[PDB]
Ligand binder design. Structure first.
Ligand SMILES: *[C@@H]1O[C@H](CO)[C@@H](O[C@@H]2O[C@H](CO)[C@@H](O)[C@H](O)[C@H]2NC(C)=O)[C@H](O)[C@H]1NC(C)=O
Ligand SMILES: *[C@H]1O[C@H](CO)[C@@H](O)[C@H](O)[C@@H]1O
Ligand SMILES: *[C@H]1O[C@H](CO)[C@@H](O)[C@H](O)[C@@H]1O
Ligand SMILES: *[C@H]1O[C@H](CO)[C@@H](O)[C@H](O)[C@@H]1O
Ligand SMILES: *[C@H]1O[C@H](CO)[C@@H](O)[C@H](O)[C@@H]1O
Ligand SMILES: [Ca+2]
Length: 599
């Protein structure tokens, strides 16, 4: 049953989500405090980085959970995530520096909170938007619990940098959320609009000027209208480029659920889940996957299917993703929420095809909660929505782990293990089914579209934030639903820990990297018995090598990386010896030790 799946998966998803958060999460142990690894996977694929997007989406889920029920463990994690942003914002990186704002569009960082120096799809202009939305989310909590002073002191300078970035750079091309298409992206623009709306509201609450953000917001919304393909009834997810695709992409479904505000009803301007444009789009996007995946064979129209990112996808051969399949369920739960709350469903010419798939022959019109048409529709949509949950559930392993993808033919997990966003996507989709909605970000002002789009932007001021700490014990006001801090699920304490050595060193032709060390498993400083690392990952300005040795839990280890040529010659990295303490903590069975070569 779907209820069984939700029951069992919920605590596993939350646990696994939090295992990916530094400094102490079970699969992110020793990462910077507040850091969110996209995945513990270090090879095939290497996702052991911090993405501005992934971390902001994960923490928006956690901040929303924290808002529903105070949890001092979550708060500690939220505060840590926020202060890490002080460090990241200040970093010169290949996207640029903080001073002119350009550095804030950097997609990802080392989990040491250092610049990722390799070639990448940069900038990605959604990051500052999502980060702002996350930090504004916690700000509203702090303000509503009498800590506005902390917002102004610690948080606001961070949010202000990101808001200025959006207001300045929204009307320039960048890479999409899949890090592939350089242009103008639906998800990116829509969240940029949301951020400006929310940021103008926060400014005014703090007594700061929101004028720059409010003057630009409606122009961002104006431009968002250009992504709509009227002849096909769907969103072209990337414009200002010809990407060699239809533009039917879960991008647009992810947009709908992430800018959901039931107080906007079925507003099509902001692409609300129940809007006619969002529904029409959903059907088109779903349909693009119906005929092409082995796992969808023999499933009829009007029944849920496994869905991926976009039909043209070749990544790992192009497969369904858990977060995509969960996203479809979530958009439908969001629509159901609004229909139930308003007691009314409207079918239009635009949404006609979506509704006719579920209730064949239904006409456009408005149906109240008491009409049988309303009942046919809402029942069919609920079954369909649970069908998308159930479809993804079919391909979740017995242990409840959520990889990034499941195989288009066999449904077995592929790509990155324990993708943090997969867990969050499960948590949000099921929250919505439960009728738990996020805090509102908008009134109808935020949905008013100007008659013309001006492409207005504002050159902003950027300053390094300075405050890097929260006051202790910032507990809720009385009455507010409260509970004991979160505690991870129990495990055995490992006698052995898999230690992935993760080294940055530029090597020449045929050279191998080995780790020589003091412990027996590292060959007692013997160069011939040293442990060889994988040249896989070595990239332009990002020369990465990984090796995983089992070392005893609690053992203190001294090591040096050796550059071993083809000829079996050894060069030693400069002093000092590295010193690492292999952890002995419950649930910590694999760690990554991130290093750079000592010249
Ligand atoms: C910057 O903003 C302007 C206004 O929204 C965009 O210009 C429009 O682009 C669409 C799609 O290419 C055209 O169909 C419109 O005619 C343009 N409108 C106007 C008034 O010029 C522009 O695409 C935006 N650029 C970026 C990179 O975001
Ligand atoms: C955050 O970190 C900074 C270091 O940049 C300190 O100065 C501050 O006290 C806080 O701990
Ligand atoms: C790593 O650092 C330790 C200090 O904890 C030294 O004892 C060792 O020699 C290595 O440099
Ligand atoms: C890891 O931690 C241990 C003790 O906590 C030290 O002995 C070692 O130097 C390393 O820092
Ligand atoms: C070490 O083993 C534990 C338990 O199987 C995993 O949770 C962890 O990811 C690592 O592989
Ligand atoms: Ca396109």
């Amino acid at each position: 049953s779907v209820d069984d799946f939700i029951s069992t998966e919920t605590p596993i998803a939350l646990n696994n989500l939090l295992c990916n958060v530094g400094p102490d999460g079970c699969r992110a142990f020793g990462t910077s405090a507040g850091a969110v690894i996209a995945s513990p996977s270090t090879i095939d694929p290497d996702y052991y980085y911090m993405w501005t997007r992934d971390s902001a989406l994960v923490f928006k889920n956690l901040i929303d959970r924290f808002t529903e029920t105070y949890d001092a463990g979550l708060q500690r994690r939220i505060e840590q995530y926020i202060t890490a942003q002080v460090t990241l914002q200040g970093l010169s990186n290949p996207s640029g520096s903080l001073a002119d704002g350009s550095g804030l569009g950097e997609p990802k960082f080392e989990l040491t909170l250092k610049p990722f120096t390799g070639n990448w799809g940069r900038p990605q202009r959604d990051g500052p938007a999502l980060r702002a939305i996350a930090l504004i989310g916690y700000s509203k909590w702090l303000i509503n619990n009498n800590y506005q002073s902390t917002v102004s002191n610690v948080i606001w300078p961070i949010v202000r940098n990101d808001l200025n970035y959006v207001a300045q750079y929204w009307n320039q091309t960048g890479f999409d959320l899949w890090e592939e298409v350089n242009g103008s992206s639906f998800f990116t623009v829509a969240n940029q609009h949301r951020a400006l709306v929310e940021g103008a509201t926060l400014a005014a609450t703090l007594g700061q000027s929101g004028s720059a953000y409010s003057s630009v917001a409606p122009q961002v919304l104006c431009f968002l209208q250009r992504f709509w393909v009227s002849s096909g009834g769907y969103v072209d997810s990337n414009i200002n480029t010809n990407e060699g695709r239809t533009g039917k992409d879960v991008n647009s479904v992810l947009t709908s659920i992430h800018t959901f505000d039931p107080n906007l009803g079925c507003d099509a301007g902001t692409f609300q889940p129940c809007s006619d444009k969002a529904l029409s789009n959903l059907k088109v996007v779903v349909d693009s996957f119906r005929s092409i995946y082995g796992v969808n064979k023999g499933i009829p129209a009007g029944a849920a299917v496994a869905i991926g990112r976009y039909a043209e996808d070749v990544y790992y051969n192009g497969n369904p993703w858990y977060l995509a399949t969960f996203a479809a369920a979530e958009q439908l739960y969001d629509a159901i929420y609004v229909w139930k709350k308003t007691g009314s469903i409207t079918v239009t010419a635009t949404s006609l095809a979506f509704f006719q798939e579920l209730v064949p022959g239904v006409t456009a019109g408005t149906y109240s909660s008491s009409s049988s048409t309303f009942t046919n529709i809402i029942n069919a949509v609920s079954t369909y929505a649970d069908g998308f949950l159930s479809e993804a559930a079919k391909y979740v392993p017995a242990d409840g782990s959520l990889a990034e993808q499941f195989d288009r033919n066999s449904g077995t997990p592929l790509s990155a293990l324990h993708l943090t966003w997969s867990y969050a996507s499960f948590l949000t989709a099921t929250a919505r089914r439960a009728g738990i909605v996020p805090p509102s970000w908008a009134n109808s002002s935020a949905s008013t579209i100007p008659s013309t789009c001006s492409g207005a932007s504002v050159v902003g001021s950027y300053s390094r934030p300075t405050a890097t700490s929260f006051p202790p014990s910032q507990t809720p006001k009385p009455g507010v639903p409260s509970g004991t801090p979160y505690t991870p699920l129990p495990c055995a304490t490992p006698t052995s820990v898999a230690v992935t050595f993760h080294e940055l060193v530029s090597t020449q032709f045929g050279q191998t990297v080995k780790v020589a060390g003091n412990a027996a498993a590292l060959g007692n400083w013997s160069t011939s018995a040293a442990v060889a690392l994988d040249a896989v990952n070595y990239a332009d300005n990002h020369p990465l090598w990984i090796g995983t040795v089992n070392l005893e839990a609690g053992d203190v280890v001294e090591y040096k990386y050796i550059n071993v040529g083809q000829d079996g010659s050894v060069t030693w990295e400069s002093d000092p010896n590295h010193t690492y303490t292999v952890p002995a903590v419950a649930c910590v069975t694999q760690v990554v030790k991130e290093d750079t070569w000592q010249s």
